[PDB]
Design a protein that fits this description.
This is part of a larger assembly, with nine protein chains of nine kinds.
Chain C (H helix, E strand, L loop, with lengths): L3 H22 L5 E9 L2 E8 L2 H5 L4 H14 L6 E7 L7 H14 L3 H15 L4 E7 L7 E7 L9 H4 L3
Chain F lengths: L5 H13 L8 H11 L5 H19 L2
Helix pairs in contact in F: 1-3, 2-3
Chain I lengths: L12 E3 L4 E3 L4 H7 L5 H11 L12 H12 L27 H18 L2 H8 L17
Antiparallel strand pairs in I: 1-2
Helix pairs in contact in I: 1-2, 2-3, 4-5
The chains are: A alpha+beta, B alpha+beta, C alpha+beta, D mainly alpha, E mainly alpha, F mainly alpha, G mainly alpha, H alpha+beta, I mainly alpha.
Chain G binds one RNA strand through α1, α2, α3, β1 and β2.
RNA sequence: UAAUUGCGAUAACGAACGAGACCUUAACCUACUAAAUAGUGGUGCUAGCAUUUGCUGGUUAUCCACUUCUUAGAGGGACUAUCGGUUUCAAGCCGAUGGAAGUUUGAGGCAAUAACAGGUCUGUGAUGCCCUUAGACGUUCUGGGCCGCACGCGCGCUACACUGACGGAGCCAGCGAGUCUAACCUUGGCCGAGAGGUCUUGGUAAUCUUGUGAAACUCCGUCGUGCUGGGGAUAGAGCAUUGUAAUUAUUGCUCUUCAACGAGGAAUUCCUAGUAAGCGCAAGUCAUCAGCUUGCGUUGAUUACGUCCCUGCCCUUUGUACACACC
């Protein structure tokens, strides 16, 4: 009966399922801490929500994220969305509603795309074209 | 007479043909129907294939 | 022995084969349609038509040799194919039956306009909402032409779809 | 039979790769206390060997005069000590 | 808050930023305000983004595509020139390197340097052609600030790429030198030369 | 172009004129009353019916 | 608490393990390397040909440590890449099967990589422990 | 015995109703079973030319065939299986029996 | 890292069978510029001579150059199964032999004249100038005369 | 208003078709069943860290209300909610404390009474008509041929070099594709730098390819203000395969030789979304591989509301001496 919440960050083709528990505040992605995300530029992007919420409130919550599908950017964005929504779910279950509202307000002020899913999935291919909506040529002579 | 088909007809488009017009071009071997494309267009509604998109 | 992916297409091809053979060899006798039923060690095929007795023939020799036809064609077990005949209800509501009747009338040789009037009055007496016939080709002319006769309104959408459009 | 181009002259870079003791200590004493130091700047000004400049920078940074703050690809941020 | 102990080393600079004040490793991304009416209500001020790789619903509305932050604008402006067009992963890297060099030089605020360069090398007016019939006619007016900054950045990058065309040397150096020349006033830049001949013909026409 | 078809226009007019007292201003209960008072073959069609119904009632209230 | 490559970095970890395996010298290198291209999609053997077999061994060991049942085909697919096949567009091409098989058999013989049930190669206990030791070494040297 | 009754149909509503009557008969007979597991419906796509010859703009059509596979894990004797198959019968529904 | 000393022995110009050799560039690219030897041959001879790539061409010895020409002219002597050679199973000898700078053109033109004198279709296409290995001169490939 | 879709309507009212309408791949069905093809909390066994909460992996029945990643169903949606600005304060166009977005929610399919002497008696066994039925224009075999070059034309591919050739290393896709007189799909070893097969506890198929390890990123080095290291195109030698046959290289590979290409002059092509394009996969013909075609994956700068100059279309005015009706 220990605390456990299961959330999911979604992208165009990337799904990252997040198990949120009450632990020591260590975040694991693909069985490893996200500090080795690799590009060293996306680490700051991942930390921006954690930076704005502060390490004080995320002291005793541990998240294990398993990602699959999509690309690097898709997976990392899905990871951020999953950790954000798992954080809000943890706040709904246990933490103060005022704290949840303040974190939601800060997140919306910074970037509305952090929690809300990026559901602008691409248009399909079309006949008589190489790309989505591009034609070859109306050759005359 | 064994001299009429000395050249092999075991494989290739000579044998991979449709059962309607016996043609060897515009054939589809997908799902093992081995039918010409236009005859498939004609009979797809009764076969089961339907136009959706 | 076959994956279901090829097996479904094979079953569709067999159904198309039976329908095409029956309509080609039974055009003179007024064929309308075929339905199938599969059960263990037996396959029943039922022909929906109008002249059930005439397609039966004398002592059912027609249906016996048609069963033997389908048998030797599709290489099933001997004697496991059985066909029956049923009189279609609402006979005039199928375009195939109307087309066969108009073919019969053309073979008889009455006027095209008289036949059009007759099929219109017959379809309205049957109760169909509307109809549309098109005669395309040469008819006492050096070059071809297309003439359409329509009764009621006929939609042109797939909202009614094959469910309501009969071609 | 045709060239279809002006085909003018090029810059004709004459970057010397061999250097003497005077050139070496001149560049070694001119690279410090300078606020404009990079691979392109050194190529433009001293016209010295890039590998020699790199090894000199590595030696100078392992002893410590100018520190690198970024270890990214194809570029390192060098800042002199005060 | 208490110091959590883990095998993973949390970097000292980001730890200090979290404890005291949010900023980069050394770059302080505060004091980003600008008093120009050409930039009021058009620049993201006091809402910084540590990374300029955002996936937001911008083009759906009317002008959010023009309301996205200036660093993202620079990223997209770099994102051009055929084969180079694309690759936002390295676009953010190259804009970060440009930020690093423009902080290493001009120890004042890099965004102050960039707005100085924009307002210094932004073409002040443009002429437009009209067909009419028989002969094309010219009519000269001024432009919008967004068009100004777009044309300035485009001309600067075009001059940099044409100076590095059929060349084997890096592009960050020439981009930085073009930006600094535009900021300070040098008369040797390609974009600056085009701008000064354009203003010559403009003042001739005025 | 967002304006709908005259057939659904007449459907809405007739529904309003025949069951005006039954329906109320609130849009949700407008949908959940139209679905049970009028037989419509499309959920989208009934949504458009109820949307134009509440729009016309808002116009009636202010206009 | 706890030492693993999951916790430690990779950029300096790969070089540290390459140096450690160079010092150990228990890889049993073939000898006929530096003449093969190592992949039909590869047209150029590495510049630092004096080594790089320790690097490839560390990479394959890390791969079979993250996963648990890999194959020579998987190794070829991972170590392959795009080929600039002239004017024709690029394509994906694998590595060299014989050198892949020889390195797999050498790993099996040395015992860093063992065989696994149902068919496949798996990380071995000694390899796991020495990986953890090198991870601790780099995590203690940098910190 | 661990029998698997597998439906390999295309009629979506027919598959739903036959699965429903099978599961309701199992429930009313009060015999252990597994839930009806639906394999993802597979779409067979044929991209073919609209026109026979090479006239007009390049236009194609994508014929689609939706096939639904589903199976229920039961444990019943042969007579009970035969009675279950005989009851709630519908033409076209393709049934098959496997034993694990 | 490691350092290197530059003495006065650095030579800008060199010779190789009365052919100019470019200096102030890498050794491997120097041999690529030299006729008859490419990038893979240069890399292989660098490995055989056992010299680090970081070292420049000036910091090379006459003994090193002699060893490099030795391996260039006799690769099979170094216990090689001879599958890295351009000229294998030659008709004139039947054994693998290394091609040299001018010897590449020599062997090519002897193959050409062999085809000419046997009057093969490949040889007649080579002499005429039209593509022999299946390419089409229909559409492109005419700005070459 | 990306539709005579609509408000209002001068004689109109009232209906019909096209349109509008009809829909998943484009979600969040957290009401409910869903992979010996799933999870973590602990469940049996394990290697390493302090015997400082446990950790990743395994064979599969070794578990305990479940569906948080993927399919459904009588029934869910967002109807441009609700407000502020402009309209004899009548359709609509815009900005805003929330759901997948509030430009019609994304792209497509089915589809206007009539016409083209537009393509197919020349890949269709729909077929009268002038052609054959003892060397037949049918069929069968070998070798040629849509595979030839002084020449022009458009689709498509590779480039003009710290972005890319690169190399040694990290981590990744959704629809689908795959064996009965056939033994097919390259899963781990042997003949073997690799290419054919020798064993199939992988396949009637989410598990063997395959959770598509490729397409874009991070430590390091050369082209370092180039008559060449971008350009394996521009030639020869060899190393390899179903096929009773591949020579005018079926295709891949290992070397050796850059005769072109410095935003490219007049004309034109395609594009507001997460679109053109930076780049690779699946299927078609297949004996071999596409660059062709039908479907996805990382992201895009400054209009989308604005007119005929050329690419044009339509309506109604207007003028006819036109009806196989400007040909």
């Amino acid at each position: 009966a220990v605390p456990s919440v299961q959330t999911f960050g979604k992208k165009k083709s990337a799904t990252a399922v997040a198990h949120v528990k009450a632990g020591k505040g260590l975040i694991k992605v693909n069985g490893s801490p996200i500090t080795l995300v690799e590009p060293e530029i996306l680490r700051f992007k991942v930390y921006e929500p954690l930076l704005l919420v502060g390490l004080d409130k995320f002291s005793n919550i541990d998240i294990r994220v398993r990602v699959t599908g999509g690309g690097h950017v898709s997976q990392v964005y899905a990871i951020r969305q999953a950790i954000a929504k798992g954080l809000v779910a943890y706040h709904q279950k246990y933490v103060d509603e005022q704290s949840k509202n303040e974190l939601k307000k800060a997140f919306t002020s910074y970037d509305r795309t952090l929690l809300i899913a990026d559901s602008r999935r691409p248009e399909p291919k079309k006949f008589g074209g190489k790309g989505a909506r591009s034609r070859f040529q109306k050759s005359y002579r | 007479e064994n001299v009429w088909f000395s050249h092999p007809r075991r494989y290739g488009k000579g044998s991979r043909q449709c059962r309607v017009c016996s043609s060897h071009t515009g054939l589809i071997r997908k799902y093992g129907l081995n039918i010409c494309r236009q005859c498939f267009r004609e009979k797809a509604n009764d076969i089961g294939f339907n136009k959706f998109r | 022995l076959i994956s279901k992916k090829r097996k479904l297409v094979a079953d569709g091809v067999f159904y198309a084969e039976l329908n095409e053979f029956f309509t080609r060899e039974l055009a003179e006798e007024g064929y309308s349609g075929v339905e199938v039923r599969v059960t263990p060690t037996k396959t029943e095929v039922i022909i929906r038509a109008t002249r059930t007795q005439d397609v039966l023939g004398e002592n059912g020799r027609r249906i016996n040799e048609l069963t033997l036809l389908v048998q030797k064609r599709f290489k099933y077990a001997p004697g496991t194919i059985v066909l029956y005949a049923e009189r279609v209800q609402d006979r005039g509501l199928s375009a195939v039956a109307q087309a066969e009747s108009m073919k019969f009338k053309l073979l008889n040789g009455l006027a095209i306009r008289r036949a059009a009037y007759g099929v219109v009055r017959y379809v309205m007496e049957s109760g169909a909402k509307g109809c549309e016939v098109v005669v395309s080709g040469k008819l006492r002319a050096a070059r071809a032409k297309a003439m359409k006769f329509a009764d009621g309104f006929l939609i042109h959408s797939g909202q009614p779809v094959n469910d309501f459009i009969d071609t | 039979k045709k060239k279809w181009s002006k085909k003018s002259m090029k810059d004709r870079a004459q970057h010397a790769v061999i250097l003497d003791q005077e050139k070496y200590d001149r560049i070694l004493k001119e690279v410090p206390t300078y606020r404009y130091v990079s691979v392109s700047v050194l190529v433009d000004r001293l016209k010295i060997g890039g590998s020699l400049a790199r090894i000199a920078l590595r030696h100078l940074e392992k002893e410590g005069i100018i520190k690198p703050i970024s270890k990214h690809s194809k570029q390192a941020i060098y800042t002199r000590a005060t | 808050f208490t110091p959590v102990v883990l095998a993973t080393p949390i970097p000292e600079e980001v730890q200090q930023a979290q404890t005291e004040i949010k900023l980069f490793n050394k770059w302080s991304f505060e004091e980003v305000e600008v008093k120009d009416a050409s930039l009021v209500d058009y620049v993201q001020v006091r809402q910084p983004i540590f990374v300029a790789h955002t996936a937001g619903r911008y083009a759906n509305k009317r002008f959010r595509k023009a309301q996205c932050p200036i660093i993202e604008r620079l990223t997209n402006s770099l994102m051009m020139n055929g084969r180079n067009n694309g690759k936002k992963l390295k676009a953010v890297r190259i804009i970060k390197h440009t930020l690093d060099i423009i902080n290493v030089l001009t120890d004042q605020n890099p965004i102050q340097v960039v707005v100085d360069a924009i307002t210094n090398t932004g073409p002040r007016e443009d002429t437009t052609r009209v067909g009419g019939g028989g002969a094309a006619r010219r009519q000269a007016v001024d432009v919008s600030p967004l068009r100004r900054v777009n044309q300035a950045i485009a001309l600067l990058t075009i001059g940099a790429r044409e100076a590095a065309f059929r060349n084997i040397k890096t592009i960050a150096e020439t981009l930085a030198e073009e930006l600094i020349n535009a900021a300070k006033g040098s008369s040797t830049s390609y974009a600056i030369k085009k701008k000064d001949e354009l203003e010559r013909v403009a003042k001739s026409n005025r | 172009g967002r304006v709908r078809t005259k057939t659904v226009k007449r459907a809405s007019k007739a529904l309003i004129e025949r069951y005006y007292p039954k329906l109320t201003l609130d849009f949700q209960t407008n949908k959940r009353l139209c679905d049970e008072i009028a037989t419509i073959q499309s959920k989208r069609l009934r949504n458009k019916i109820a949307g134009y119904t509440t729009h016309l009632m808002k116009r009636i209230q202010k206009g | 608490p706890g030492v693993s490559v999951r916790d430690v970095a990779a950029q300096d970890f790969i070089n540290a393990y390459a140096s450690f395996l160079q010092r150990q010298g228990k890889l049993e290198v073939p000898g006929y390397v530096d003449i093969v291209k190592t992949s039909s999609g590869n047209e150029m053997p590495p510049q630092d040909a004096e080594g790089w077999f320790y690097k490839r061994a560390a990479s394959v060991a890390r791969h079979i440590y993250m996963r648990k049942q890999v194959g020579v085909g998987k190794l070829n697919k991972l170590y392959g890449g795009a080929k600039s096949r002239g004017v024709r567009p690029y394509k994906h091409i694998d590595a060299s099967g014989s050198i892949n098989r020889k390195v797999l058999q050498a790993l099996e013989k040395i015992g860093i990589v063992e065989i696994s049930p149902k068919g496949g190669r798996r990380i071995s206990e000694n390899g796991q422990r020495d990986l953890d030791r090198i991870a601790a070494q780099t995590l203690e040297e940098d910190e | 015995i661990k029998i698997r009754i597998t439906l390999t149909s295309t009629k979506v509503k027919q598959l739903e109703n036959v699965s429903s009557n099978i599961v309701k008969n199992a429930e009313q007979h009060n015999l252990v079973k597994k839930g009806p597991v639906r394999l993802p419906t597979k779409v067979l796509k044929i991209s073919t030319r609209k026109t026979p010859n090479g006239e007009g703009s390049k236009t194609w059509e994508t014929y689609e065939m939706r096939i639904h596979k589903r199976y229920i894990d039961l444990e019943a004797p042969v007579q009970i299986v035969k009675r279950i198959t005989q009851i709630t019968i519908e033409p076209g529904v393709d049934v098959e029996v496997v034993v694990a | 890292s490691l350092v290197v000393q530059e003495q006065g022995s650095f030579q800008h110009i060199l010779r190789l069978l009365n052919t100019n050799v470019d200096g102030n560039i890498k050794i491997v690219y120097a041999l690529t510029t030299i006729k008859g030897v490419g990038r893979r041959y240069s890399n292989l001879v660098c490995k055989k001579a056992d010299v680090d790539l970081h070292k420049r061409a000036g910091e090379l010895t006459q003994e090193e150059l002699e060893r490099i020409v030795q391996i260039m002219q006799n690769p099979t002597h170094y216990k090689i199964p001879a599958w890295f050679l351009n000229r294998q199973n030659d008709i004139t000898d039947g054994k693998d032999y290394h091609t040299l700078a001018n010897n590449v053109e020599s062997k090519l033109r002897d193959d050409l004249e062999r085809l000419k004198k046997i009057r093969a279709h490949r040889g007649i296409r080579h002499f005429w100038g039209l593509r022999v290995r299946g390419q089409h001169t229909k559409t492109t490939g005419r700005r070459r005369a």
